[PDB]
Design an enzyme around this catalytic site. Structure first.
Site, PDB file in Angstrom:
ATOM      1  N   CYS A  43       4.315   9.464   3.480  1.00 22.35           N
ATOM      2  CA  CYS A  43       3.600   8.905   2.325  1.00 22.35           C
ATOM      3  C   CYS A  43       4.331   8.427   1.072  1.00 22.35           C
ATOM      4  CB  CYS A  43       2.549   9.917   1.873  1.00 22.35           C
ATOM      5  SG  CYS A  43       1.814  10.928   3.177  1.00 22.35           S
ATOM      6  N   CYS A  46       5.015   4.377  -0.015  1.00 25.08           N
ATOM      7  CA  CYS A  46       4.005   3.584  -0.701  1.00 25.08           C
ATOM      8  C   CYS A  46       3.418   4.219  -1.952  1.00 25.08           C
ATOM      9  CB  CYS A  46       2.851   3.292   0.233  1.00 25.08           C
ATOM     10  SG  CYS A  46       3.189   2.362   1.726  1.00 25.08           S
ATOM     11  N   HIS A  47       3.355   5.546  -1.973  1.00 27.65           N
ATOM     12  CA  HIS A  47       2.773   6.271  -3.098  1.00 27.65           C
ATOM     13  C   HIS A  47       3.739   6.756  -4.162  1.00 27.65           C
ATOM     14  CE1 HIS A  47      -1.407   6.209  -1.796  1.00 27.65           C
ATOM     15  NE2 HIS A  47      -1.034   6.451  -0.555  1.00 27.65           N
ATOM     16  N   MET A  84      -4.000   0.948   3.759  1.00 31.19           N
ATOM     17  CA  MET A  84      -3.888   2.393   3.908  1.00 31.19           C
ATOM     18  C   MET A  84      -4.094   2.770   5.383  1.00 31.19           C
ATOM     19  SD  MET A  84      -3.437   5.520   2.921  1.00 31.19           S
ATOM     20  CE  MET A  84      -3.898   6.882   3.925  1.00 31.19           C
ATOM     21  N   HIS A 323      10.791  -7.602  -5.851  1.00 31.49           N
ATOM     22  CA  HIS A 323      11.497  -7.081  -4.711  1.00 31.49           C
ATOM     23  C   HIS A 323      12.802  -7.809  -4.419  1.00 31.49           C
ATOM     24  CE1 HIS A 323      11.900  -5.797  -0.393  1.00 31.49           C
ATOM     25  NE2 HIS A 323      11.770  -4.648  -1.028  1.00 31.49           N
ATOM     26  N   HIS A 365       8.038 -12.517   1.331  1.00 35.91           N
ATOM     27  CA  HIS A 365       9.247 -11.801   1.685  1.00 35.91           C
ATOM     28  C   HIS A 365      10.332 -12.809   2.053  1.00 35.91           C
ATOM     29  CE1 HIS A 365      12.029  -8.986   3.437  1.00 35.91           C
ATOM     30  NE2 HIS A 365      11.330  -8.026   2.862  1.00 35.91           N
TER      31      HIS A 365
END
Ligand code: DHE
Ligand code: DHE
Ligand code: HEC
Ligand code: HEC
Ligand SMILES: [C-]#N
Ligand SMILES: [C-]#N
Lengths: 539, 541
Positions: A43, A46-47, A84, A323, A365
């Site tokens: 997790c 992403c979190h 998610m 990014h 990307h």
């Protein structure tokens, strides 16, 4: 006692507004540690480490206790359609593990370690002193045509001879090297692991050896060297995810000189963010600067190195979730992608400002991007996407093409979503696009090729993984990369650790299979960086 | 959307789970018990130990250290204190044995978290009371604005404008709680005041009666405010520094509109380790470049914040020494002479060449305020400072051009009444040097000031019984901050008594050292800082 009465008055902070964090479901040491292990394994990406949220919504106790046990168990089980993953429906986690996860995220996020100068100096090692290093190239390798290939899960890199298609040297590095960058002299290869360990390799020794190493944080992705005239091998910079910081080091020995925190205010809401991860870093050719991307805050920092004792930083505001990126054809405009914002930011390295914010498709990307001259629109920069199959073409000539400057001039269509890298070369009339993370096996195991002399025609599918003749495994194809003279394009067939992998070489002039590189040491090949093309930003 | 982006970020974090620590093993205490202790903490302990307990003047009170010490060690230290700045909460009978136990149990828990304060909160607190177009075009009063004093009425949450010549209160204005300082705009029209609660108030001295035109709250706790003083930038920007959250804010110098907020959380100068609470201290506006010179305390950094392009901010971070606090310009307004109080040093920042010129060793806990500048008959142009830790007064040479042998050296020393000093003062037209002793443990010393003869520095000081001259009766009657008038013939002092007691402002004739006048008023509750308009605007000290 004078100084005691001096600081004797009450703080202006209302104690009532300073809150005690608790009211969480009881869990033992065994239960908490099992849950904490799953968190960083599945997790944290992403979190975030502190759970304040990155790609994912904030998972702090104020929000999770409000939702309650049942909601949380149900969301982790079924997931959501907005990115998610379903941990229960897919059978990845058990009912028991999901219950432990729902319980965990209701507690205060456990505190991670910091990493300053004492820790950095402790990890710093000079293996071969500058005084004792070669004075000239003591080997007969064609260094400009060498490739620095990442052997991911093995915690190593392999130097592959461009012409012979053989492994020359396998070197022990940090775990899962993310990128490889060359020094401005073309002598030193710099690699950085995700564990934030940096290795400096001298390509001039009889056999290329490591001359120094250091660990700049707990987690990192980028490393870069100074490229402004008169600063060859002077400074090396590295960016970290945890702690949110970057570090400037000596370009000859890797000596830690300065560490700067990236914890700050956001560009959009202008609120405090405790975990702004450092993304891409690119050396300026216009000023003695490093162009540093700070993700969650959406800030592009121009770090001046003319005087590293008294550092000058210019904070340019861009767009959230910065990014990857790269230079335009002229090496002046840093074209970076703010992925979750579905935009591409243009940073003028000369006038030191945000030139524009260009709307593109879902989750851009680019990697470093792909530059070519369009017959109708002039000089363009291109990017593929993770969220869709589009390829955006953006005009990069404000001087001779103002009508098209910073406009999404045209679009091309690839095989589908899950694309990671687009590629071309000055001496080539082809444009390559991978689809690494596409859910279909056939699409992810192949690449799309466009004709630059005829962009109206659909692409040609190249069966890269099939050509490799490897057998079982996902065989995901990633990153198209050219050689020194631009007549051949290399691809990585990224297969599992226990399976067989390969590097596939295609003849750019004929679009035919030229060679396949197999070796028992070629474990989990990801990034490939051609020395010349990396050093001189040829894309 | 979908599955592609889920595999892209599907890999494990490089962070070892085993190294991320769960906090606890603390003594169980109820809500009422936790809140009683948390109340005492912010009332009595936060100033020195910090809001997050990572340590400031005081040592770290983080769970790792406190749980190691144990319940009994903690109770004993809070009770008796130490000789190195830690007060005796139990021996003095300030806290009960039951309260000390609650405190010992409290500091063993994870520090509670205060709120943040960003742009949404700042804009919500931002008010324009009188729009620029609706404001006067000329001075609509007969007040002698240059000779006006802005006196802080601390506990009342107000300020008072006192007419220099008449000695009367012209207007009392409602401000933020306990105003720390007053600053003037470069034009001399606007008075800027900031409370310790981070509430700023902008006052127009040109209106019929000096009234507030704008207000805003830049944090939960603050100390400094400043205006842009570079040529071509009169009243352009206003900056303010906060203690909590560790940040500074740049606003529009006409409306107080929040434009930029920057975090000061970062790496230290000495150890180069992360600090989660670097408080903002003194801020001074440059005359040499379009910048603000911001002091960052715990990290020991002096930041040169360029406001030429406010959208893309450029900051130059100069390393100095830990615990940067107060300071002021030298006589030439080029060198920012600031004190790194707990480091026992005075840093010199060259505002022209934009660098650290030196770190001068001085006495124990230097506290200059803005400092005192005069020409020494032997050593040439100097800058002076008094101390909290001792009775010494340091004289530092400030002329590299004509006196290079003395530049950045503690050239000579003067001796005052004792420790507990806060402010030293002089003026160009004056031949006297005044120094208070506000926090001196002796009553008679704290109720008086010392005066030196600049024409004969070998002779000992004269004692002026400021509080006794005030004729106020009972109370601590601590005297604080000497401040001159525009002419330089009057020196004002504040007799800072308790809110329920009687206070006064004592004026002394600088030419004769005799009592000139005493300002008493029922509204003059807890007077602290007094700022003469002309002298503050033009940095005359
Ligand atoms: C910040 C960043 C950069 C730009 C640095 C620069 O150029 O200065 C970068 C570049 C890169 C590049 C550079 C290519 C180039 O041509 O410039 C490569 C090979 C690469 C292989 C991968 N990246 Fe990367 N990557 C991340 C971050 C980044 N990757 C992540 O955080 C993420 C989303 C999740 C993760 O688990 O790391 C991620 C996923 C991946 C992968 O899945 C890849 C294929 C394999 C791996 O080891 O994780 N990333
Ligand atoms: C950061 C700072 C400055 C410099 C600002 C600038 O010039 O830009 C300053 C200036 C000042 C000045 C400026 C005078 C000048 O002529 O420049 C005054 C009057 C002043 C009255 C006090 N200060 Fe002050 N003061 C602090 C901080 C500061 N004080 C503290 O943190 C401290 C130690 C603890 C506190 O309780 O706030 C402290 C104690 C005091 C007092 O006890 C005083 C006498 C009364 C009060 O209201 O707290 N401080
Ligand atoms: C990224 C590739 C993800 C990984 C890995 C995990 N989560 Fe996540 N999560 C993610 C997103 C993009 C979102 C937003 C959902 C939306 O539809 O907007 C979330 C959300 C959650 C939540 C809910 C928050 C709330 O609404 O109150 C929870 C409880 C959650 N995620 C938990 C969680 C856990 C415990 C995971 C690992 C085992 C996990 N997530 C992985 C993206 C991603
Ligand atoms: C500044 C004027 C102080 C106030 C107000 C409080 N403390 Fe303090 N504390 C201070 C100093 C300078 C020191 C260092 C003492 C030394 O001799 O080096 C300390 C130390 C403590 C400690 C001990 C830390 C340790 O060594 O483990 C404790 C437990 C402590 N102080 C607690 C504390 C509490 C609870 C207070 C408020 C009721 C308090 N301090 C106020 C300076 C000052
Ligand atoms: C990496 N993307
Ligand atoms: C204030 N000192």
């Amino acid at each position: 006692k004078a100084a005691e009465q001096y600081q004797g008055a009450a703080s202006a902070v209302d104690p009532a507004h300073v809150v005690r964090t608790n009211g969480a479901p009881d869990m033992s040491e065994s239960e908490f540690n099992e849950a904490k292990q799953i968190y960083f394994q599945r997790c944290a990406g992403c979190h975030g480490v502190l759970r304040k949220g990155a790609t994912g919504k904030p998972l702090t106790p104020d929000i999770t206790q409000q939702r309650g046990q049942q909601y949380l168990e149900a969301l982790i089980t079924y997931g959501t359609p907005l990115g998610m993953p379903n941990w229960g429906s897919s059978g990845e986690l058990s009912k028991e593990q999901i219950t432990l996860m729902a319980k965990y995220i209701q507690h205060t996020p456990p505190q991670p370690p910091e990493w300053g100068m004492p820790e950095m100096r402790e990890s710093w090692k000079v293996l071969v002193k500058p005084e004792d290093r070669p004075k000239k190239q003591l080997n007969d390798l064609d260094l400009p045509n060498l490739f620095s290939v990442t052997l991911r899960d093995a915690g190593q890199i392999a130097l592959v001879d461009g012409d012979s298609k053989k492994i020359v040297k396998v070197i022990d590095t940090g775990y899962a090297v993310h990128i490889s960058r060359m020094s401005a002299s073309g002598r030193y290869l710099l690699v950085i692991g995700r564990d934030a360990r940096i290795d400096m390799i001298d390509l001039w020794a009889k056999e290329p050896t490591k001359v120094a190493e250091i660990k700049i944080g707990i987690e990192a992705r980028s490393v870069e060297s100074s490229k402004f005239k008169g600063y060859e091998d002077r400074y090396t910079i590295a960016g970290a995810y945890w702690p949110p910081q970057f570090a400037i080091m000596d370009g000859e020995t890797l000596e830690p000189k300065q560490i700067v925190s990236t914890r700050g205010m956001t560009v959009d809401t202008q609120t405090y963010h405790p975990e702004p991860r450092v993304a891409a870093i690119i050396a300026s050719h216009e000023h003695p600067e490093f162009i540093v991307n700070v993700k969650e805050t959406g800030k592009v920092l121009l770090v001046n190195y003319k005087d590293i004792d008294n550092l000058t930083v210019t904070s340019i505001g861009a767009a959230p979730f910065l990014h990857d990126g790269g230079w335009d054809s002229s090496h002046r405009y840093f074209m970076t992608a703010a992925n979750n914002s579905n935009k591409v930011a243009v940073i003028d390295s000369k006038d030191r400002r945000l030139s524009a914010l260009v709307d593109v498709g879902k989750t851009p990307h680019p990697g470093r991007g792909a530059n070519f001259v369009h017959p109708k629109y002039g000089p363009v920069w291109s990017t593929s996407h993770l969220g869709d199959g589009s390829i955006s073409l953006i005009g990069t000539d404000p001087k001779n093409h103002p009508q098209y400057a910073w406009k999404k001039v045209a679009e091309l269509q690839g095989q589908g979503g899950g694309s990671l890298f687009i590629k071309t070369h000055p001496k080539s009339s082809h444009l390559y696009v991978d689809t690494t993370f596409n859910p279909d096996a056939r699409i992810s195991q192949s690449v799309a090729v466009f004709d630059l002399k005829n962009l109206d025609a659909k692409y040609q599918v190249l069966p890269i993984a099939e050509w490799a003749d490897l057998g079982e495994g996902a065989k995901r194809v990633v990153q198209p990369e050219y050689n020194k003279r631009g007549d051949e394009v290399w691809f990585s067939v990224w297969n599992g650790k226990n399976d067989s992998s390969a590097l596939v070489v295609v003849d750019d002039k004929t679009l035919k299979l030229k060679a396949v590189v197999k070796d028992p040491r070629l474990i989990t090949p990801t990034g490939k960086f051609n020395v010349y093309n990396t050093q001189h930003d040829v894309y």
